[PDB]
Amino acid sequence: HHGSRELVEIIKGIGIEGAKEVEEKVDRQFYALQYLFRHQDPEMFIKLVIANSLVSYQLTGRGEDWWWEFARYFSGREVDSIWKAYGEFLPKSKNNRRLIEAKLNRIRKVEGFLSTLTLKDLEGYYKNMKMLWKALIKIMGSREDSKTIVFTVKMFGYASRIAFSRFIPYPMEIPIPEDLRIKSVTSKLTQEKPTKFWMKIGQESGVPPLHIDSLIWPLLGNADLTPLDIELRNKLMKLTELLGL
Amino acid sequence: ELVEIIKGIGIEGAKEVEEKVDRQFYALQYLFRHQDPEMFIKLVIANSLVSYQLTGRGEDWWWEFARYFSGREVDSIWKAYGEFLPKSKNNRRLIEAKLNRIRKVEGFLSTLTLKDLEGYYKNMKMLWKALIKIMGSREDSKTIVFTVKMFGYASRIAFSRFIPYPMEIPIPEDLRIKSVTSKLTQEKPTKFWMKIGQESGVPPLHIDSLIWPLLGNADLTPLDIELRNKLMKLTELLG
């Protein structure tokens, strides 16, 4: 379990400020959320993003397509029960129609928690994201490093920065979302568990693993980096090389 | 046939293209979150008025603008551009003339409050005429009509309300649009597309939004299936 001086260095060179640029100018899920926010109540918008995140696994389509499908469905839609809306949404969806019973059960669980929260409580959770993290681990009964829990924090942070008009960095303590592709890329580097491997990279670089996640994913896909400054693009090309793609 | 497809997409389809796919709209949504509303709109007007004879792609230019003004205090827009353009990647050409144009519009903008801007959003033909007057341009100037178009974007974001562009404002007529139009007609794009608009009920500045994603092999995956299907038939017709 060797570390990586070169990954630390490039990620440090990019910085949280670089990850923020990628998140807001490249990440297509962010843009889907920007659209829904313009067509939804702010409080409901944030809660829907939490609920959606909790069922964004074993999809029947591309993740980006799924988040756009969510954004179109809830745009201009009055939601009373989040649980009842997903009951109608998922079975008729293109991109998420497997394991609907299990996923609806998950939304049922979180729905209680969310019913207790005001918009000010959510602004509170944005200002203190480890608290949300811990509260989601509680209500869902999942591991600290559960890919779906940490992804839900990440997406909550996207929604909040849109809704609350300010950027707050993710906590260093929240691990990277370890889905199959992140395991795959990481395994080319090490046999160490990705969440542990990338926590150390994050700690040493000063860039939280949830912001590191934002740097990696465009490089795994088909990203348009032209919104970014030449210096940032150059660093991302170096990162691409160091990851072996 | 072109009329029928465009009528089918409609202003509402144009709106979704603008708001989900258009890369300038994306850039402005970014800048809006990092500026105060009144300065945001004013910056967009001034920028548009110097968005000609670029030294890069238009979309790259709008991102470069967004990046430059993100979180930036602006005391004089004219002063800010005197710093910005000479060091720019994508607009390092005809800087003296462009700075002169910003000097001219800055005087007009300085008179305007956020409420005055919202009134120009409600009367976009008044803004068009106003900019032709202060800038000394043509009615079918690409740069002037595209300035009203981007002002519309900025205003939609800042005021959270949609008002369709006026039917009278012509399409921005550059070399790319002349290429497309010449496969369809010999008439001047500005005239042809005005007629296409009256007949389809879709103002020409909204029609502009339909063509460019198609020109540029844009990703239409954000859009509803039915709209994406209408756009693919448009792509065939236009070639």
Swiss-Prot record, chain B:
The lineage of its organism: Archaea, Methanobacteriati, Methanobacteriota, Thermococci, Thermococcales. This is N-glycosylase/DNA lyase. It catalyses: 2'-deoxyribonucleotide-(2'-deoxyribose 5'-phosphate)-2'-deoxyribonucleotide-DNA = a 3'-end 2'-deoxyribonucleotide-(2,3-dehydro-2,3-deoxyribose 5'-phosphate)-DNA + a 5'-end 5'-phospho-2'-deoxyribonucleoside-DNA + H(+). Residues 118-182 are annotated as: Helix-hairpin-helix. Contains two alpha-helical subdomains, with the 8-oxoguanine binding site located in a cleft at their interface. Contains a helix-hairpin-helix (HhH) structural motif and a Gly/Pro-rich sequence followed by a conserved Asp (HhH-GPD motif). Transmembrane segments: none annotated. Belongs to the archaeal N-glycosylase/DNA lyase (AGOG) family. 8-oxoguanine binds at residues 24, 51, 62, 146, 172, 208, 212. It comes from Pyrococcus furiosus (strain ATCC 43587 / DSM 3638 / JCM 8422 / Vc1). Gene3D superfamilies: Hypothetical protein, domain 2 (1.10.340.30).
